[PDB]
Design a protein around this nucleic acid. Structure first.
Ligand SMILES: Nc1ccn([C@@H]2O[C@H](COP(=O)(O)OP(=O)(O)OP(=O)(O)O)[C@@H](O)[C@H]2O)c(=O)n1
Ligand SMILES: [Mg+2]
Ligand SMILES: [Zn+2]
Lengths: 1080, 49, 250, 16, 121
DNA sequence: GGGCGCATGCTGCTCTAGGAGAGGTACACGGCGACTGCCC
DNA sequence: GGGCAGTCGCCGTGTACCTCTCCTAGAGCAGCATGCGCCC
RNA sequence: AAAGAGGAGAGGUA
């Protein structure tokens, strides 16, 4: 009974299942007969068999060694001759296909990747009307296929019908109708207003088949000599060849639905009846029949969703088309016998196409794996960009707006806040996609005024419900039966109206049917602003998993499903007992007697260097049931999502530490290990083979002390369990290199005498600056071990380092209601305000920011959490709760607080004059504050923006090759850019020497840099600058364009002419090295 | 936000060479200044201008 | 053009990097050589005109790609970069390398609120300060507390001896620093302060200067610059010090 | 123009 | 005082273009014309002899070392090795020196043919 | 059975080229200057 | 002759910073290591 | 003595 929310990851699984079941078989059957140019020897593919091979590596092994999770495809073949007999048949290997993980992702080159869904136009026919600057209403029609060339029809201001093929000039429709082989009698039988076409016939003249073909050739191919057979060939290759034109099932279905035809579903090419019906519809629309309508292109009934299987089919098509030409060329060129089918197939283009699609495409994306919510959200995204979609620069403005047809199908809140805002969306919670590519939503039917809540809800599409009166999900019923009230709001013909409770047709299932998963986890959301809801949804996906997570006291009811539908919770499948529990293994024995075993992940790494860990919940000998949780992941409590913690909060100002959205916290949050997280990083090294000689991984590192080799072992690899700081040696690598930078006399004398020594260089692997932690895993891969190393390499080493991080000053914290801040101070617990119980507070927030940001749901949440903690109740509330009353939330909170006060027996926990306020004392002096303040329990999170990954400084480093300016980037010791706005500010101030020193000495004056550095070191004055390098580069670039540009010196006296100055010459006899150095 | 940036770049480019170079030019020409009103209400007084 | 402005680059292990000017120059040279060879052996004068046309098109593509006819396309369907594309637009030479630059002796970090400060003071973390003031510290280590040479001072700094902090505490006394926030809409977006060393990894800012910068303490970051010469220090002290900006220029 | 070639701007302290 | 006073731009004649990228040697020969679409050798990473990266036209690729590896050191102040023609100096000269190509047939500059005003027309 | 000779798939060196579309098309929006039609 | 009016093509569209991946081209020709057949 | 070369996509923060 009732309604159960279905799986949230059904799109990807359904798409891949459809691909495997039908797409490959249908695709392999569209090119099976391959012929040579002249005669016999046809090649055939039996595509229905298509066997698959078991993968060689599992998911964990593939991720360990940076591999790919894939299978191999084998398809039987056959080569006949029919002239001398001797049929041949064997099995052909066509390539390898990546496999889908049961979580719905792909493993490519050791990385998790996702494929997003695309929103595109639907194939079919569309009509439009437009007005000129002088009136003169005009009509157009456009026919769009799944793949091929479009068709266009237009009406003129005089009453003439024109045809525009692809991108050619206008054409009379008579030539196109006659070239198809239609007489005037059959043309007049399909037009309902034949006197309208007479004008076109008269003003454009009559044509025969051959004359029409000649005219078609003339206009389509200007310059070439016309020919009847030629024009016939263009027509056939344009609109009738089933290799360059495709309608699709959806296209044929839409054409039949719109134009009212009954053509069979197996025809996927244009016919004459379709063109005649389109012209008839255009004519009838012009003459205002009243039963013909124009089309809206933003309507969700005219748009389609494309998923992974449909996108893979096209790449398979391109690869097979590329392979077929090679097959034919090899079949014709060779003139020998024993041409085996296995020797006629070159599976290079297919493999290349599949690899390019899965590795370097726009819709294949690096998956977001900060926490389970982000991973779940990434899989349900809809994108309007990509091949066949739109472009950021060429996108208009109607595509970034909200349409009335989006309700219940696309969330109107979750969207990016950057340059691509309004172009990427999220699927709604209750939405689903049918077998044509359109989105449906469910409703309940009503009869005479009673909601039938036990009658198998009806799924409807955007165009099906345009002619019915549909009510929202907040309509209140007496006993789940009759609709109360006398004026019910409804939607009719894409308009909000009101009607009596007897003309209603359907009702939505839930009040939260309009939003997405992330937005559905915010309680008391109807008391906030929409922008703050968007910010809260965005910030909920940036939380870090904690050491010991906690589920919220005040929830919404969707946490268990969100935790379950992402794939880290293990549940008992039978009704038995527990036989064996261990930190890495759980066994379940049922009542019958069979056993089930599970292994658990332990301290693994995610895409964003977070932690994935599983722990048991049950004990030995416990009695379990079906569906009970026995283990959980890193960011989940016992079956529920848990991202933050519940802490004590008061709303009042401190001594300036809450000034502008800053946060003051206590020291208990540090030494009690609250908000402490674990991070894991990976380092890699390889041993190549240079032309001079192979490099070696060894321990004998030239010119290094003994204290730098304590932790290495035999080979020269760090030991597991060691503590490393910056500069430590992880893997010792030495390169045999013969650099020539010394006088050859000593080298030749040593070579002749002998005494072979170390002529090598040291470039070993060291940990970067600002890193420390424990070594937890070392993996070594070599040859002679069945390992697939990159070409030109002999050994690969991987090291894993783990770290624990606590909260500190400069870290970002946030809640679920759009409130964010930065920690500015940590206080000892004897200095914080305390309660009449004597308990110090945990965090102090400024009230000034509550009414300015217009997010007052946090006060409701805190006041409910206070009572929840005092009662041990853990309430759950559904949004839009005012349909049962007028002050539902306030009354609920007040009742809970009064009940808690009565139960605990402490009269100070609730007050009647100030319902939400308590008295608070000062921990420094012991004096109470003037007025009571607001105290509660808040659910807070810690984000991934930590100050440890943001501090950077530079004095001198690398420079660019061309412009000789400092490099840019944190990862390569880069400098900060001084843009033109800062130059404007410095010019407005009047400081000229600062600007001049910034522009020349500190950026690219190759000689002045060293002079300045050495003058500073020696304590003398800084000499005057010269000319920057970029000006000389610009002068050379301008001269390369054959322009005579030069600098001149004015003539002081006499008739002597001005003299050209050589800028690229040395003035002073001093050295100019590439980088500043300390001389002596 | 691109429109305002384009406008301010054009404004900066049109008048980047106006610099005080002279002390006095000896001119009797000038402009007339009064208050900014809308009907009988003063939006901007004459003392501020 | 000189060869050092179009470098070849020796990454890729065994292959080489791609530069677009070299391809156009090679095409021009190839067409010229073919035309000369054809002209030498007295070819029929219907094949020579073809080579002349292709040479003209190649030179046109080298000068300005896509100005007249079709555009030359590299490996993927991506047009090449000609000589006129280097000096043309927002990413050209003029607006990227001449009117703005990257600089040395600069830093960047997150900002927190510091009360109990003076309006002309700021708080600088020690990790940033030890890097931004290196030559002055080296000079003071050589002059006072006679060490020996530069190498010993660098070893002392790297080893993190406690003396370098005592030296740095008095190197920075009296030396102004410049602070900037990313959108600089007017001249009050850059200002000069006097630094004091603090423990942590965030910069402390006086609450009374926030509205001029338009900054709040919920995620913003700031950039720090250090003057070098005596004239620059005098200008920073007497023209841009944050305690002398009382009224608005507008 | 003095910015592009790297000279003292004719305004402020670089007036003369 | 100042090194220069003003900048001037004008049209370029073929004589000036030839003068930009032509230098003589104490042998009687002239260098500066590129006649091969070759950059560097694949086996040993050294430039070719008459291509786009030649050392006789643009300069040495290593400081105070000629191409044939027979003259070295700094005591020479601008002598030229008489086996390959490479001058012995620093490699910074590779940032200034220019070359030129002589065309078999004349061609038209596209800036003066396709413009908002057409000067040839 | 076994060593040797030949066919053959695999793969790295080389060079050369470099043209012209195949079709990835139909796909933003405003301001200003330079040709061309069809009439008075 | 004298145009108006219409159409087509080129120019332009804020600032700083952080992380992840893939690619420097592609086909012909010859060297080589392997598999398989052959004669004793 | 040595040490990073550019380019193209995708996603974020003020
Ligand atoms: N496209 C953008 C977005 C943001 N900003 C800068 O970032 C600021 C945004 O500040 P933010 O903290 O996001 O919001 P506020 O308006 O300050 O509001 P509040 O802090 O109260 O949320 C802008 O004022 C501006 O300085 C910008 O320059 N360009
Ligand atoms: Mg803010
Ligand atoms: Zn030599």
């Amino acid at each position: 009974a009732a309604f159960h929310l279905p799986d949230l990851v059904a799109i990807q699984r359904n798409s891949f299942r459809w691909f495997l079941e039908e797409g490959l078989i249908e695709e392999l059957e569209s090119f099976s007969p391959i012929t040579d140019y002249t005669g016999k020897l046809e090649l055939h593919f039996l595509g229905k068999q298509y066997k698959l091979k078991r993968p060689k590596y599992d998911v964990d092994e593939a991720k360990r060694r940076d591999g790919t999770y894939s299978v191999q495809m084998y398809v039987p073949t056959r080569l006949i001759n029919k002239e001398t007999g001797e049929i041949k048949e064997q099995e052909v290997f066509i390539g390898d296909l990546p496999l889908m993980t049961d979580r719905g992702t792909f493993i490519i080159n050791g990385a998790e990747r996702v494929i997003v869904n695309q929103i595109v136009r639907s194939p079919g026919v569309y009509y439009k009307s437009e007005r000129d600057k002088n009136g003169r209403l005009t009509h157009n029609a456009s026919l769009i296929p799944n793949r091929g060339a479009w068709l266009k029809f237009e009406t003129d201001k005089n009453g003439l019908v024109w045809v525009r093929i692809d991108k050619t000039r206008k054409l009379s429709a008579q030539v196109l109708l006659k070239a198809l082989g239609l007489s005037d009698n059959e043309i007049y039988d399909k037009l309902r207003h034949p006197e309208y076409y007479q004008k076109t016939i008269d003003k454009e003249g009559q044509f025969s088949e051959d004359e029409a073909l000649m005219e078609l050739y003339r206009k389509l191919r200007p310059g070439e000599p016309p020919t009847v057979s030629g024009g016939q060939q263009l027509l056939e290759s344009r609109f009738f060849d089933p290799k360059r034109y495709d309608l699709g099932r959806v296209g044929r279905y839409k054409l039949n639905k719109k134009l009212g035809l009954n053509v069979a579903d197996t025809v996927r090419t244009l016919t004459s009846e379709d063109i005649l019906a389109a012209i008839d519809y255009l004519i009838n629309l012009e003459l205002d029949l009243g039963g013909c309508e124009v089309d809206d292109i933003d309507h969700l009934g005219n748009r389609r969703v494309r998923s992974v299987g449909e996108l893979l089919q096209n790449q398979v098509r391109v690869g097979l088309n590329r392979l077929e030409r090679i097959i034919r060329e090899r079949m014709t060129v060779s003139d020998s016998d024993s041409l085996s089918p296995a020797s006629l197939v070159n599976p290079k283009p297919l493999v290349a196409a599949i690899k390019e699609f899965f590795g370097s495409s726009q819709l294949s994306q690096f998956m977001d794996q900060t926490n389970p919510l982000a991973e779940l959200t990434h899989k349900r995204r809809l994108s309007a960009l990509g091949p066949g979609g739109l472009t950021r620069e060429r996108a208009g403005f109607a595509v970034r707006d909200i349409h009335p047809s989006h309700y219940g199908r696309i969330c109107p809140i979750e969207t990016p806040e950057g340059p691509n805002a309004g172009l990427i969306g999220s699927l709604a919670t209750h939405a689903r996609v049918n077998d044509y590519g359109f989105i449906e939503t469910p409703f309940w039917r009503v009869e005479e005024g009673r909601v039938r809540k036990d009658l198998a809800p009806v799924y409807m599409t955007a165009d099906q419900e345009d002619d019915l009166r549909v009510a929202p999900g907040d309509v209140a019923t007496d006993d789940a039966g009759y609709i109360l009230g006398t004026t019910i709001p409804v939607r009719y013909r894409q308009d909000f109206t009101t009607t009596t409770p007897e003309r209603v047709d359907y009702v939505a299932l839930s009040p939260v049917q309009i939003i997405s998963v992330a937005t559905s986890l915010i309680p008391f959301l109807e008391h906030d602003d929409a922008n703050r809801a968007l910010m809260g949804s965005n910030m909920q996906r940036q939380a870090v998993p904690l050491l010991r997570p906690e589920r919220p006291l005040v929830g919404t009811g969707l946490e268990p499903q969100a935790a379950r539908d992402s794939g880290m919770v293990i549940t008992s499948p039978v009704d038995g007992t527990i036989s064996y529990v261990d930190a890495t293994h759980i066994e379940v024995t049922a009542d019958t007697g069979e056993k089930y075993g599970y292994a658990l992940q332990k301290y693994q790494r995610s895409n964003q260097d977070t932690c994935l860990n599983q722990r048991p919940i049950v004990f030995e000998g416990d009695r379990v049931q079906r569906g009970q949780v026995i283990a959980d992941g890193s960011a989940t409590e016992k079956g529920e999502l848990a991202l933050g913690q519940n802490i004590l909060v008061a709303y009042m100002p401190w001594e300036g530490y809450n000034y502008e959205d800053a946060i003051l916290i206590s020291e208990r949050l540090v030494y009690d290990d609250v908000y402490t997280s674990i991070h894991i990083e990976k380092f890699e090294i390889e041993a190549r083979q240079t032309k001079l000689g192979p490099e070696e991984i060894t321990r004998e590192i030239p010119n290094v002390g003994e204290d730098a080799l304590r932790q290495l072992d035999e080979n020269g690899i760090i030991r597991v369990g060691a503590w490393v700081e910056s500069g430590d040696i992880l893997v010792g690598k030495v390169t045999p290199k013969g650099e020539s930078d010394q006088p050859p006399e000593e080298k030749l004398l040593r070579a002749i005498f002998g005494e072979k020594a170390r002529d090598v260089r040291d470039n070993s692997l060291r940990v970067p600056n600002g890193e420390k932690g424990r070594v937890v895993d070392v993996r070594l891969f070599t040859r002679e071990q069945g390992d697939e190393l990159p070409p030109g390499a002999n050994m690969v080493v991987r090291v894993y380092v783990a770290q624990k991080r606590k909260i500190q000053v400069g870290d970002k914290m946030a809640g679920r209601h759009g409130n964010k801040g930065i920690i500015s101070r940590i206080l000892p617990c004897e200095d914080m305000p305390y309660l009449p119980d004597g308990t110090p507070l945990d965090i102090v927030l400024n009230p000034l920011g509550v009414p300015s940001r217009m997010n007052v749901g946090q006060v409701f949440e805190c006041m409910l959490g206070w009572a929840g903690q005092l009662l041990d109740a853990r309430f759950k509330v559904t949004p839009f709760d005012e349909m049962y009353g007028a002050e539902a939330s306030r009354l609920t909170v007040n009742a809970k607080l009064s009940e808690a006060r009565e139960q605990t027996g402490q009269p100070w926990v609730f007050s009647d004059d100030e319902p939400g306020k308590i008295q608070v004392y000062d921990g420094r002096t012991g004096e109470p504050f003037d007025r009571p303040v607001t105290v509660g329990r808040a659910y807070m999170l810690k984000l991934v923006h930590l100050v440890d990954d943001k501090i950077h400084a530079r004095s001198t480093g690398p420079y660019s090759l061309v412009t000789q300016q400092p490099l840019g980037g944190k990862a390569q010791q880069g400098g900060q850019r001084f843009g033109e706005m800062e130059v404007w500010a410095l010019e407005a101030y009047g400081a000229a020497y600062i600007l001049q020193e910034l522009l020349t000495v500190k950026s690219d004056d190759m000689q002045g840099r060293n002079e300045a550095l050495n003058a500073i070191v020696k304590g003398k004055a800084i000499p005057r600058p010269g000319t920057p390098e970029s000006f000389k580069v610009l002068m050379r670039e301008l001269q390369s364009l054959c322009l005579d540009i030069a600098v001149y010196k004015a003539s002081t006296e006499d008739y002597e002419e001005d003299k050209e100055v050589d800028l690229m010459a040395d003035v002073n006899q001093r050295r100019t090295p590439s980088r500043p150095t300390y001389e002596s | 936000t691109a429109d305002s940036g384009y406008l301010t770049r054009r404004l900066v480019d049109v008048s980047q060479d106006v610099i005080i170079h002279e002390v006095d030019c000896g001119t009797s020409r000038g402009l007339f200044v009064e208050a900014m009103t809308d009907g009988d209400r003063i939006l901007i007084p004459i003392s501020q201008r | 053009i000189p060869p050092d402005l179009r470098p070849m680059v020796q990454l890729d292990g065994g292959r080489f990097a791609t530069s677009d000017l070299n391809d156009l120059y090679r095409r021009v040279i190839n067409r010229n050589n073919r035309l000369a060879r054809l002209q030498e052996i007295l070819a029929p004068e219907i094949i020579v005109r073809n080579e002349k046309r292709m040479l003209q098109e190649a030179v046109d593509a080298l000068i300005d790609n896509g100005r007249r006819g079709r555009t030359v396309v590299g490996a993927n369907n991506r047009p090449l970069k000609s000589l006129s594309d280097i000096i043309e637009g927002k990413q050209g030479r003029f607006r990227q390398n001449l009117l703005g630059k990257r600089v040395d002796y600069s830093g960047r970090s997150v900002i927190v609120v510091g009360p109990n400060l003076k309006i002309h003071q700021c708080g600088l973390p020690r990790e940033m300060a030890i890097e931004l003031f290196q030559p002055f510290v080296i000079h003071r280590l050589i002059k006072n507390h006679s060490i020996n040479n530069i190498k010993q001072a660098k070893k002392l700094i790297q080893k993190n001896d406690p003396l370098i902090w005592d030296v740095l505490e008095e190197v920075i006394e009296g030396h102004p620093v410049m602070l900037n926030r990313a959108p600089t809409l007017h001249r009050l977006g850059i200002q000069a302060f006097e630094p004091i060393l603090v423990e942590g990894r965030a910069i402390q800012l006086h609450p009374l200067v926030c509205p001029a910068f338009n900054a709040d303490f919920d995620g913003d970051q700031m950039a720090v610059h250090v003057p070098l010469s005596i004239e620059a220090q005098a200008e920073a002290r007497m023209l841009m010090l944050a305690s002398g900006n009382i009224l608005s220029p507008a | 123009e003095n910015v592009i070639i790297g000279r003292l701007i004719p305004a402020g302290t670089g007036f003369k | 005082e100042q090194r220069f006073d003003y900048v001037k731009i004008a049209l370029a004649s073929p004589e000036r273009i030839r003068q930009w990228g032509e230098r003589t040697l104490p042998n009687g020969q002239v260098v500066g014309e590129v006649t091969k679409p070759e950059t560097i050798n694949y086996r040993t990473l050294k430039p070719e002899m008459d291509g786009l990266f030649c050392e006789k036209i643009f300069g040495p690729a290593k400081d105070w070392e000629c191409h044939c590896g027979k003259y070295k050191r700094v005591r020479h102040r601008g002598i030229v090795c008489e086996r390959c023609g490479v001058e012995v100096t620093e490699s910074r000269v590779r940032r200034h020196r220019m070359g030129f190509i002589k065309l078999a047939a004349p061609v038209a500059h596209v800036w003066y043919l396709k413009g908002i005003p057409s000067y040839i027309a």
